[PDB]
Amino acid sequence: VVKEIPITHHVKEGYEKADPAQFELLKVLGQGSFGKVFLVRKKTGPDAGQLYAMKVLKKASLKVRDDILVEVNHPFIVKLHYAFQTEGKLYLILDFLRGGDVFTRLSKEVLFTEEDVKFYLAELALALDHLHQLGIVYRDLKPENILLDEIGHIKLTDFGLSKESVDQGTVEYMAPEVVNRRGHSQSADWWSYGVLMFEMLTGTLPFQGKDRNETMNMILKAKLGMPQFLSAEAQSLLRMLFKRNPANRLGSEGVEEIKRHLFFANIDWDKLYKREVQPPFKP
Numbered sequence: 001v002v003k004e005i006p007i008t009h010h011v012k013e014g015y016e017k018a019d020p021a022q023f024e025l026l027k028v029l030g031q032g033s034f035g036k037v038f039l040v041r042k043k044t045g046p047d048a049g050q051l052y053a054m055k056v057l058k059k060a061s062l063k064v065r066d067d068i069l070v071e072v073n074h075p076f077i078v079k080l081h082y083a084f085q086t087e088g089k090l091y092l093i094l095d096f097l098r099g100g101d102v103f104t105r106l107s108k109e110v111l112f113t114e115e116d117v118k119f120y121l122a123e124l125a126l127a128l129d130h131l132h133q134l135g136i137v138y139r140d141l142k143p144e145n146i147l148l149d150e151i152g153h154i155k156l157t158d159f160g161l162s163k164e165s166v167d168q169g170t171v172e173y174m175a176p177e178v179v180n181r182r183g184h185s186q187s188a189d190w191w192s193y194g195v196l197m198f199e200m201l202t203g204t205l206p207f208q209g210k211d212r213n214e215t216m217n218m219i220l221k222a223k224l225g226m227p228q229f230l231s232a233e234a235q236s237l238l239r240m241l242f243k244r245n246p247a248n249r250l251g252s253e254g255v256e257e258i259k260r261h262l263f264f265a266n267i268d269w270d271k272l273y274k275r276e277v278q279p280p281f282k283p
């Protein structure tokens, strides 16, 4: 059973309850669909002077089929340091990712190989499945959510939160069940995974119209040519991910069939998880 768990309070192990007067607004890190993400400096305690990202929502919940904030911790998922509420607003204090997003870093290279992309998709698959083993669905997977740390490793900017902006959803990566509105599943995550792999590999989106409606009819119905310049294993993985019907889609029966795909044959997953696999690029 899906159980939503509201996010009202969270103090990272060993630390004390935080509040807005312990932080220092410095800069606007970016703008996301649910409002701005800020840069703050903590002025207090063992981590006084530490830089964090801060998200300011009206409310947020975590829908989990079946501490959940301590179990979501992952090498490639942004870490929650503090969560609190003041004056009708929920504050989210998280890791400051200094790498920028992946797509930009890719744009600062004249070219890259399928290997380079493969690194990112491998780490990403690890994080996604880590959320899936916990009954969490990422729901909104996009490039703006995939950033890099200081080394070049992947870090997702959220972890399946159901959120609500305070100042009173990306169709391009929606699976056809989500456009038809039959609910987010982990298989939908894998569809979006496939769209991210397609864009990172061709520099183009598979489906995109003049409006959001056209993009939806395209996702549901349009033809999609297979880019011939792709390796047999990349084309294989892609066509295995682009199943309009979930449970027919790869990944709907675990991540294991994904990790064992020919495309990822030269990837040691234990070394990847332990971040002993060097990034293609330093940010």
Ligand SMILES: Nc1ncnc2c1ncn2[C@@H]1O[C@H](COP(=O)(O)OP(=O)(O)NP(=O)(O)O)[C@@H](O)[C@H]1O
Residues within 6 Å of the ligand: 029, 030, 031, 032, 033, 034, 035, 036, 037, 053, 055, 078, 094, 095, 096, 097, 098, 101, 140, 144, 145, 147, 157, 158
């Ligand atoms: N921890 C972080 N460190 C550095 N930059 C971040 C961090 N979190 C978000 N950003 C930047 O702020 C922007 C918003 O990211 P995001 O976390 O998607 O905001 P959001 O609106 O809460 N999520 P969504 O509504 O799904 O887009 C992104 O373009 C990131 O570059």
